[PDB]
């Protein structure tokens, strides 16, 4: 399925979108949904968040330079830091970038939805507490790291954590091209098949330190090619096997 969230005429709701329509779901959104006999075609819908996430939490870098370097000595452990949910934005609303920011990048990320509650989650039990996978922008200040040390505000600023556009449930995120672009130029492309930690790992070391909810978003970490976004911009992010995050870029 794909799973997601809708602007309708006659108000929000949490959708399976199909083709294309997007029918509205009643019951058991983690599990196996019900209907509630609404639908819309998707062309007449706003495209919202996917997901009410309590927390977002997020791999540095992560990936490996080329298929080579994936054979060698283990990589350094992970590096997390939490995005407040209050910085989740969807596709097409604008990245608004702070005054007090001079210096801001695009960072695109395979998303990980958690769909169980769960704690001290094994590698191999990860895929059973997955809803499924989506595409994320870690935007960054990087001013801000630099002056902090911390990346808590430079990551953290409202609007910097577009998802979207939808969450893919039948999904092997082994090996997905992803590619990031600022106005049609590619600036990042890779393939998740050279994260260092992989899906399971990532969930095995973040559920070892806390508590995931349904809805919580893990992103896992990006490539190469990491570069500015400024005023005017447009930046997208494109997942195989899910589609393409795509948002404008406003000064303020």
Known sequence: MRLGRI??????????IEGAIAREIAEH????????????????VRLLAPILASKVVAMGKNYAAHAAEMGGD?????????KP?????????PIQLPPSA????????????IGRPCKDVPAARAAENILGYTIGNDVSARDHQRADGQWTRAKGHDTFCPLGPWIVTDLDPADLEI?????????????????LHDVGAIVEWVS???????????LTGTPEGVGPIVDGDTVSVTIEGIGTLSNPVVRK
Do not use: K, Y
């Open 85 to 93: 949910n209050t910085s989740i934005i969807g596709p097409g609303l």
């Open 208 to 218: 070892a330190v806390m508590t995931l909810l349904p809805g919580d978003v893990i």
């Open 179 to 195: 590619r990031t672009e600022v106005n049609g130029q590619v600036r990042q492309r890779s393939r998740t098949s050279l994260l």
């Open 102 to 113: 001079t210096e801001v990048h695009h960072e695109g990320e395979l998303a990980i939805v």
């Open 74 to 82: 283990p990589p350094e452990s992970p590096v997390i830091f939490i």
């Open 29 to 44: 959104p983690f599990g196996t949904p019900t209907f509630t006999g609404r639908q819309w075609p998707l062309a007449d």
């Open 7 to 16: 602007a309708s005429p006659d108000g929000v709701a949490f959708v399976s």
